[PDB]
UniProtKB/Swiss-Prot annotation, chain A:
Protein name as it appears in the record: T-complex protein 1 subunit gamma
Disulfide topology: C359-C365
Matching NCBIfam families: chap_CCT_gamma (TIGR02344), thermosome_alpha (NF041082), thermosome_beta (NF041083)
GO cellular component: chaperonin-containing T-complex
Domain of life: Eukaryota
The keyword Phosphoprotein is assigned to this record: yes
Upper classification of the organism: Eukaryota, Fungi, Dikarya, Ascomycota, Saccharomycotina
Major place of residence: cytoplasm
Function: Molecular chaperone; assists the folding of proteins upon ATP hydrolysis. Known to play a role, in vitro, in the folding of actin and tubulin. In yeast may play a role in mitotic spindle formation.
GO molecular function, one term: ATP binding
SUPFAM superfamilies: GroEL apical domain-like, GroEL equatorial domain-like, GroEL-intermediate domain like
Keywords (A to Z) from UniProt: Acetylation, ATP-binding, Chaperone, Cytoplasm, Disulfide bond, Nucleotide-binding, Phosphoprotein
Subcellular location: Cytoplasm
GO term, biological process aspect, one: chaperone mediated protein folding independent of cofactor
Swiss-Prot record, chain B:
Protein name (Swiss-Prot/TrEMBL): T-complex protein 1 subunit zeta
Main location per the UniProt record: cytoplasm
An individual GO BP term: chaperone mediated protein folding independent of cofactor
Entry GO terms, CC: chaperonin-containing T-complex
Family, as annotated: Belongs to the TCP-1 chaperonin family.
Gene of this entry: CCT6
InterPro entries xref list: Chap_CCT_zeta (IPR012722), Chaperone_TCP-1 (IPR017998), Chaperonin_TCP-1_CS (IPR002194), Cpn60/GroEL/TCP-1 (IPR002423), GroEL-like_apical_dom_sf (IPR027409), GROEL-like_equatorial_sf (IPR027413), TCP-1-like_intermed_sf (IPR027410)
Compartment(s) where it occurs, according to its Swiss-Prot or TrEMBL record: Cytoplasm
Source lineage: Eukaryota, Fungi, Dikarya, Ascomycota, Saccharomycotina
Pfam families: Cpn60_TCP1
Length: 518, 534
């Protein structure tokens, strides 16, 4: 019913500690397998952190907040799902004795977590090292981190080309002191939307700039490409129009019957004549096209496309600029067909397609993927999004940070040094943040099999005297430098990792009561 | 760390349950292995008792809540689709490998090092797999060697008396379907049919096809030798008007005249059929005419066809009509108007084997049948189910021998030698790791379960035979020559598996070592069990 006093603070930390404790063995490339027991006779052997917690039914509401935290992390970064949840769960565990046994007010701890978050972001920027974002050979070795241990490792070179050529098309990199700096905005969601074509080879997969249409041309003999195109978009079909009111044509006189039959053909030509007034080279309609409208527009020297989806024409309007106008008599001259390179109808996989591809980058592109089957295309799809997500974090900041527990320990050492110079009651919960940062590398040690206490203190000694680039090896499990075998990941992953971790930790600390009601 | 309606087994407690889960499934299937194995009962709940030694049928008919045995059953189902044999062999390798690993888990060894020791030893096992295998010639005159492969797949599931019965049946079934060249073999061309009322030891091989419905008339010829075949699609029985009508007879004899006038349309096609026999080898000996006609035939035409000594079949299965078309060679005749002697096929002696209730017509002695049949005989459903398991697994065992030219000797020759291999190689090599030595030694000692439990089901002392085989291998290495040693279950001493004729398929052992390693590896990777949503 109601949880008052310190009982609510216990249940909020315990719920977040239980969610993190499950995936502690899910961290690292060597991470163990989790066998889940379904209410039925089935089982789940998947080690993916998101696929596990999704199949785990939770009761306490703080556990549901940790589930929604991983959903936000999945939209930002493609990997490291368990890294954020374990880190956010350990911070509440380390602040638990200070909140109760030491009797520190929670607002003091929350204000201390905001100071530790700002200091942590500064340390990550200091331990991060720059890399050339314009080097094609360097970007392939970066994305390769999210490539290997997958079926795409053989095509990885082609997987990086499809990843780079896609983000480089939709990215706008600008800055100045006049109109401001967009800070290298890249949209993978809307603009990079992909079309998967079965059959063929991965080498034949191209990134097309434009909107791809699966519908063919109404007539076999027609202009294949136009130099300076004029495009008209309209939802209305092409056929004889009828009045919305009651229309009855009574024919008595003998010679007036054939005249009305000619007018019906003239009305179809009139609707096409209103389109030809702007001299379009391309006509795209949502519904079908009558055979008469096909012949009238064929002699008019324009291209006709039929049975095109409405959602596709909306994406065409942004890369082109032609606005959909229902009635042919209302067609504006302001909307044009400029920046369309080729109409090429070339057949791909025994199926006629239509290409809107151009020579320019109107902040969007359509990726054409080829594979050996639909399951291969689905594997290329999800891997391409993770491939571009890594390339996105590299284009959203030049600096790379060492992984494998190197950055995790590098921050914890600097937090311990700033703790001695930070006066006030917030010093005690500030030291709990550094102890929570040591949980991630110690977790990789526990999954490796080595002594967690011995290897952690020795790894901390490497950061204190030597450099911060000495991490833990995944294959071996012994303390080594990350410069030898680069595990290096972009900094944006570490940025949003500690960022949302403090926001999720403070959110649960602010709730002192839980009641049930509608 | 708990919420209502949840259960969690954590902190190495799941390992003690999972290893015990394998020990429970192992001890059940440890009873049946090799020719000395045991028979079990499977109750479907409907009251039908089924006795089979095949681990494929066992794991599907039993329901197990233990999730460890579920993964073993699911992975063995993939092994049953690929290998088709040695389902128990895979289970015995998984269980014992977890037992040897659980002993090191109690020592504090991390399971990743244990699983890494299995993968490193598996890669070295594949190297010895290619070295230990024996390349068999591609000659099809190898039937003598096929007699050894047959006894390997037979003696396991039978009393060894049905082996001598099924040995010429299975061996002749494969080579008759298989043309002489390297192309392929089709197991669908071998029909599996079951019959009652006769002992299982009388099971015979059918070179042609077997069918149920025979010619019904007391005077029809029972044995017809070297007869022409007619595949006919048209109904020879009485027909009725497609529209509603009636027969109005003024006189008593007119009633038979109207019935004969309607059948005259069918009798017109009947006269064209009997004229074909009068045109071709009517009185000629060693030649005959058979009607396999697919649709029904009235008893009036059966009496007419009996006077001509024509075998007339009616209501034949649609699938058999196309099969008899390829076996006999005669095309399917839809209309009698197009009937010609060049369309007729040719078959050998066609004789009806008639029991009390049923009649059996045989299509055998065909020029180019390209389809075999194995007719399984038994008095009860117990012998019919056990033989069907031996035929299906027996044909697929020989099938993998022609597809894969490499063969490996059985009787534990591959398991004992590889276990001794990794023991001596790892000490000489030492290039893996110091902590990996536990995973390699546990994997080598775990593969001894098959030769240990094979003689354990035989009753002989496993410590005695494993010592004599190991001493014989050491005496073979001291003599500096290649000697293949294997266990003898009847006598209890060692022997030569190449001379005794005990062989194991290469593809079966390749997926058994790789499969069982992957099964036990994923089971050791489970630290905690979780039950939620229930």
């Amino acid at each position: 019913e109601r949880t008052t006093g310190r009982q609510a603070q216990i249940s909020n930390i315990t719920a977040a500690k239980a969610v993190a404790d499950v995936i502690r063995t899910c961290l690292g490339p060597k991470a163990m397998l989790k066998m889940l027991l379904d209410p039925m006779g089935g089982l789940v052997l998947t080690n993916d952190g998101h696929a596990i917690l999704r199949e785990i039914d939770v009761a306490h509401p703080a556990a549901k907040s940790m589930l929604e935290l991983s959903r936000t992390q999945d939209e930002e970064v493609g990997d490291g799902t368990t890294t954020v949840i374990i880190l956010a769960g350990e911070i509440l565990a380390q602040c638990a004795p200070y909140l109760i046994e030491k009797n520190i007010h929670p607002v003091i701890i929350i204000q201390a977590l905001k100071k530790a978050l700002t200091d942590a972001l500064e340390v990550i920027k200091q331990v991060s090292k720059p890399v050339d974002v314009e080097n094609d050979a360097a970007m392939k070795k970066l994305i390769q981190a999210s490539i290997g241990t997958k079926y795409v490792i053989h095509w990885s070179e082609k997987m990086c080309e499809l990843a780079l050529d896609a983000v480089k098309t939709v990215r706008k990199d600008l800055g100045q002191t006049v109109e401001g700096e967009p800070n290298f905005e890249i949209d993978i969601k809307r603009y990079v939307r992909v079309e998967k074509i079965p059959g063929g080879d991965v080498l034949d997969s191209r990134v097309l700039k434009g909107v791809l249409l699966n519908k063919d041309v109404v007539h076999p003999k027609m202009s294949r490409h136009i130099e300076n195109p004029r495009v008209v978009l309209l939802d209305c079909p092409l056929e004889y129009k009828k009045g919305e009111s009651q229309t009855n044509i009574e024919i008595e006189k003998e010679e007036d019957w054939n005249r009305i039959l000619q007018i019906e053909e003239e009305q179809v030509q009139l609707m096409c004549e209103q389109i030809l007034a702007v001299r379009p080279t391309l006509v795209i309609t949502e519904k079908g096209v009558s055979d008469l409208a096909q012949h009238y527009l064929l002699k008019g020297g324009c291209s006709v496309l039929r049975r095109v989806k409405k959602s596709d024409n909306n994406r065409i309007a942004r890369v082109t600029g032609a606005t959909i106008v229902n009635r042919v008599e209302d067609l504006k001259e302001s909307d044009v067909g400029t920046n369309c390179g080729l109409f090429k109808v070339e057949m791909i996989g025994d199926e006629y397609f239509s290409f809107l591809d151009n020579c320019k980058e109107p902040k969007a592109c359509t990726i054409m993927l080829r594979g050996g089957s639909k399951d291969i295309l689905n594997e290329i799809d999800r891997n391409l999004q993770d491939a571009m997500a890594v390339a996105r974090n590299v284009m959203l900041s030049p600096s790379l940070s060492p992984g494998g527990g190197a950055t995790e320990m590098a921050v914890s050492v600097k937090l311990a040094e700033k703790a001695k110079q930070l006066e006030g009651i917030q010093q005690w919960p500030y030291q709990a943040v550094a102890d929570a940062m040591e949980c991630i590398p110690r977790t990789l040690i526990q999954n490796a099999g080595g002594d967690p206490i011995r290897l952690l203190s020795q790894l901390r000694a490497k950061h204190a005297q030597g450099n911060f680039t000495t991490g833990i090896d995944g294959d071996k499990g012994k303390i080594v430098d990350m410069v030898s075998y680069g595990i290096w990941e972009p900094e944006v992953i570490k940025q949003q990792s500690v960022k949302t971790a403090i926001e999720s930790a403070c959110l649960l600390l602010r709730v002192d009561d839980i009641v049930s009601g509608v | 760390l708990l919420n209502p309606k949840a259960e969690s087994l954590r902190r190495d407690a799941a390992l003690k349950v999972n290893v015990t889960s394998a020990e429970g499934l192992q001890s059940v299937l440890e009873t049946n292995l090799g020719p000395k194995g045991t028979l079990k009962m499977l109750v479907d709940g409907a009251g039908n008792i089924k006795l089979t030694k095949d681990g494929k049928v066992l794991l599907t008919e039993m329901q197990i809540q233990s999730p460890t045995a579920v993964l073993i059953a699911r992975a063995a189902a993939a092994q049953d689709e690929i290998t088709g044999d040695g389902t128990t062999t895979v289970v015995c390798l998984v269980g014992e490998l977890l037992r040897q690993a659980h002993r090191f888990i109690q020592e504090g060894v991390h399971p990743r090092i244990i699983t890494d020791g299995f993968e490193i030893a598996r890669k070295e096992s594949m190297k010895f797999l290619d070295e230990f295998k024996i390349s068999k010639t591609n000659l099809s005159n190898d039937r003598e060697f096929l007699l050894q492969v047959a006894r390997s797949s037979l003696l396991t599931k039978v009393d060894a008396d049905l082996t001598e019965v099924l040995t010429p049946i299975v061996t002749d079934a494969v080579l008759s379907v298989y043309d002489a060249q390297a192309d392929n073999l089709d197991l669908h061309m071998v029909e599996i049919m079951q019959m009652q009322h006769l002992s299982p030891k009388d099971t015979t091989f059918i070179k042609g096809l077997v069918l149920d419905h025979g010619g019904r008339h007391p005077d029809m010829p029972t044995r017809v030798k070297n007869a022409y075949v007619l595949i006919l699609n048209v109904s020879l029985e009485y027909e009725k008007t497609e529209v509603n009508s009636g027969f109005f007879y003024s006189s008593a004899d007119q009633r038979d005249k109207l019935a004969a006038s309607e059948r005259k349309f069918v009798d017109a096609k009947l006269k064209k059929i009997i004229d074909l026999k009068n045109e071709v080898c009517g009185m000629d000996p060693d030649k005959g005419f058979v009607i396999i006609n697919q649709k029904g035939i009235d008893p009036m035409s059966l009496d007419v066809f009996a006077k001509h000594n024509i075998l007339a079949l009616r209501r034949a299965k649609r699938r058999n009509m196309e099969r008899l078309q390829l076996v006999t060679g005669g095309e399917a005749q839809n209309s009698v108007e197009d009937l010609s002697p060049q369309i007729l096929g040719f078959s050998g002696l066609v004789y009806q084997e008639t029991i009390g209730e049923e009649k059996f017509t045989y299509v055998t002695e065909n020029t180019d049948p390209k389809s075999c049949t194995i007719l399984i005989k038994g008095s009860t459903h117990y012998a019919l189910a056990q033989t069907k398991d031996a035929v299906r697994d027996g044909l697929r065992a020989v099938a993998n021998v022609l597809k894969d030219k490499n063969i490996i000797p059985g009787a534990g020759a591959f398991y004992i030698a590889l276990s001794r291999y990794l023991r001596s190689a790892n000490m000489n090599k030492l290039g893996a790791k110091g902590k990996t030595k536990t995973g390699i030694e546990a994997f080598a000692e775990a593969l001894l379960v098959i030769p240990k439990t094979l003689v354990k089901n035989s009753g002989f002392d496993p410590l005695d035979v494993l010592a004599m085989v190991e001493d014989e291998l050491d005496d073979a290495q001291d003599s500096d020559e290649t000697r293949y040693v294997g266990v003898d279950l009847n006598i209890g001493d060692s022997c030569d598996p190449t001379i005794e004729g005990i062989w194991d398929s290469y593809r079966v052992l390749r997926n058994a070592i790789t499969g069982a390693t992957g099964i036990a590896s994923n089971l050791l990777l489970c630290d905690e069990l979780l039950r939620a949503g229930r």
